[PDB]
Amino acid sequence: GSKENMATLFTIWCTLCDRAYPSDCPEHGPVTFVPDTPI
Ligand SMILES: [Zn+2]
Numbered sequence: 001g002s003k004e005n006m007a008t009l010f011t012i013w014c015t016l017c018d019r020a021y022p023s024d025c026p027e028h029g030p031v032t033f034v035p036d037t038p039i
Contacts, residue, residue: 010020
C-alpha cells in the first residue's frame with residue numbers, strides 16, 4: 001500500500017492467516033477488512 005516502512009518485506013497482512021505475504025494471500029487474497037465484530 002503506502003504505509004509499509006522499515007518492515008516492508010511483506011505488503012498485505014492476512015489476519016486470517018496471522019501473517020503477511022509479499023503479495024495477496026494465496027488463499028484469502030487481499031484484505032479489505034478485519035472480521036472483528038465488537039460486542
Ligand atoms: Zn490468508
